[PDB]
């Protein structure tokens, strides 16, 4: 699977390692949520990450299924 | 009106200044929300404070109507 990631500069799409067959997006607010919106973490995973309180996580299993908000398709 | 405030040490109940007849509670997450819970700002106001996205603001108009979760 190919996933978007926020581990790179610029943000990019990567082929996930073997055994990591999901893409994920984890978002949460920090103190600047009211101006910059949610913090977004994108990457590859073997199992969908578990969420702590006030965090959201979604996973998906098609290429590039987890875009940053400023990189959604058109 | 007497309102709880988070501007004092320790946090306390204060007689609001003239023209400030509401108590308010304003909450948001910071980077520790997942462990410490929301940040809470308590005080007096003349009008209910404007809210930005991801902020919650609620006002009330009886004495000490806006307690901090840990004094409640």
């Amino acid at each position, epitope marked *: 699977i190919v996933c978007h990631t926020t581990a790179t500069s610029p943000i990019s799409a990567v082929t996930c390692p073997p055994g990591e067959n999901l893409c994920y997006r984890k978002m949460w607010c920090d103190a600047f949520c009211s101006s910059r919106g949610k913090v977004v973490e994108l990457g590859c995973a073997a199992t969908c990450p*578990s969420k*702590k309180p006030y965090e959201e996580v979604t996973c998906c299993s098609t290429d590039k299924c987890n875009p940053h908000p400023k990189q959604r398709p058109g | 009106i007497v309102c709880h405030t*988070t*501007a004092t*040490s*320790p*946090i306390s109940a204060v007689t609001c200044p003239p023209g400030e007849n509401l108590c308010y509670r*304003k*909450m948001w997450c910071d980077a*520790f929300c997942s*462990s*410490r*819970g*929301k*940040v*809470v*700002e*308590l*005080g007096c106001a003349a009008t209910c404070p404007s809210k930005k996205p991801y902020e919650e603001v609620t006002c009330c108009s009886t004495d000490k109507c806006n307690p*901090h*979760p*840990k*004094q409640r």
Partner: antibody
Amino acid sequence: QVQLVQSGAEVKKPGSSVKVSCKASGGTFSSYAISWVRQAPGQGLEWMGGIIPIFGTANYAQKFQGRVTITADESTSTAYMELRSLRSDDTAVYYCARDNLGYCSGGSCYSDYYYYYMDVWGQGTLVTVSS
Amino acid sequence: ASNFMLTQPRSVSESPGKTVTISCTRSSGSIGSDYVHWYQQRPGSSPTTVIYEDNQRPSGVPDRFSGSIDSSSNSASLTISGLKTEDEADYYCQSYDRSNHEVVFGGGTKLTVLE
């Protein structure tokens, strides 16, 4: 560079109480929490509770609730641990320790208790209880 | 009613210059649900923090100290590369039990340097 300075070692009879002090340099606790942590001889660290002066509230571990009282006076920046009904299992070194993450900044404060890492530790106080 | 446990090996011994890992396994609940921190306690001294928030180093702690989390084994680990005799001490992990509202300490690991 706050330091925490504790009172000295004591030797006690069973059934008595000990009240150990912890004075913070700088004249204030600000919005920090102070914990008490003890260590029986050759054993591990054990949390007893803590206090958050800016809220006027204290939190206790179940093992000690009802026998220990933790207090603090902002005016003297001193915290205290009073442990009553002393027994042999209470021979231990007692430490106070500051929670690195203050509870308030900018006129607002966190909603929930959550004991974070302990950055500044006192020097320890040995309390020895006879049989 | 009981807090979760954080289990550490009681003793670890290794030659200087080598890398040692000390693990801390959470007995119930996910390790990732709560930050893990690590303290060093030299004999006759108070604890000091070597790692906080799973993998952060306080100012002044050598970069030979690192922290990690392994979700599959529900553990946190402290790693010390380039082991030195001055690293001999007891090491404790620490987390927090939200249900009981209590700090939880691991049992401690005594690190000895073999000559």
